Amino acid sequence: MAEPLLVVGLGNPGPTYAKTRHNLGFMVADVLAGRIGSAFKVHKKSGAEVVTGRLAGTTVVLAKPRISMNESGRQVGPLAKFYSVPPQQIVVIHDELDIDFGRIRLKLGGGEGGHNGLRSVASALGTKNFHRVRIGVGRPPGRKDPAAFVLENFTSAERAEVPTIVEQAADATELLIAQGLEPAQNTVHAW
Q1: CA–CA distance from 185 to each of 64, 127, 180 (Å)?
Q2: DSSP per position, 54-89
């Protein structure tokens, strides 16, 4: 056993939320599984969905939580001990408010901003040192509040651009793993 890696995506359960701005993390994950072969199934001694296999040159483990978020770290902590994994070999995908609509950036460490799920995770592990993949959506109209703006649907002109963007994020995840942080930062960035 050469000591593996663990990849994770964030979102909420049901038909009611399937296509809001806050569910982007779920969409990129259904695609990666189609590039491997099989479908999901529940892990009984923790309670979540999992898939195992081969990718970009090495041994990998994939997942999706099943609870409302201010309650989502009670299943991520236990899963990490069952297989004996270090904190520097963990990767996570989510949505971002401080960048324009159609941009991507990579990172290690720092502050959590305004996402509720990110804080629940670092509080169960005991530290803030893990890797991240950011995707932006913009700022609110006038005097409209930030927590109500992310639960709505997209407008019509933004709707014909979404399937193109989901493809570019998957290609970028395979490169971090097979080449490294500093060099992969030189092809995708600006200023």
Answers
A1: 27, 24, 9
A2: EETTEEEEEEE--S-GGGTTTTHHHHHHHTT--GGG
Determination technique used: X-ray
Of 22, 115, 131, 189, the catalytic one is 22
The CA distance from 95 to 150, in Å, is 10
> Could you confirm whether 22 is annotated as catalytic?
yes
Residue type, 99: I
Look at domain 1-191 and name its CATH class.
Answer: alpha beta
User: How many Cα atoms sit within 13 Å of 48 on the Cβ side?
Assistant: 23
